[PDB]
Design a binder for this molecule. Structure first.
Ligand code: ZN
Length: 137
């Protein structure tokens, strides 16, 4: 029915091209609402960084560029890898990614249409998971 509803837990990160699931739509996040980046350690296996170092128009401050990302399952260049506070966050598109839902797959060209939710990168956690200066127990 109406009320286009699609939970992240229901939305999986796949390759519109491949479509084998390169991640989860509930494992990705946003960065200062500038560019969506799906965080995942096993993602490095789902993509290969180009040879060249930085290949972008200009460089950013809030974060630095990385390497051109390309779905290893297929190759469809997602974009480039971005680092922030020492966090490898791949910057993919919305047209290169597929949102597998129990209501039907969805492929947008703008995250502005993304059905699932995309929370910003919780640095507090990543910091609490990278520092652990708080506690372990
Ligand atoms: Zn691919």
């Amino acid at each position: 029915g109406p009320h286009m509803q699609f939970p992240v837990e229901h939305v999986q990160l796949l390759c519109i091209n491949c479509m084998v699931a390169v991640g989860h739509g509930s494992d990705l996040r946003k960065v200062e609402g500038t560019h969506h980046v799906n965080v995942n350690p096993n993602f490095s296996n789902y993509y290969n960084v180009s040879r060249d170092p930085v290949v972008i128009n200009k460089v950013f401050k809030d974060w630095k560029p990385g390497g051109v990302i390309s779905c290893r399952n297929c190759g469809e260049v997602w974009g480039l890898q971005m680092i922030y506070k020492s966090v490898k966050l791949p910057v993919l598109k919305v047209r290169s990614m597929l949102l597998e839902t129990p209501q039907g797959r969805i492929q947008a060209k703008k995250w502005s249409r993304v059905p699932f939710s995309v929370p910003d990168f919780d640095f507090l956690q990543h910091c609490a998971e990278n520092l652990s200066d708080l506690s372990l127990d």
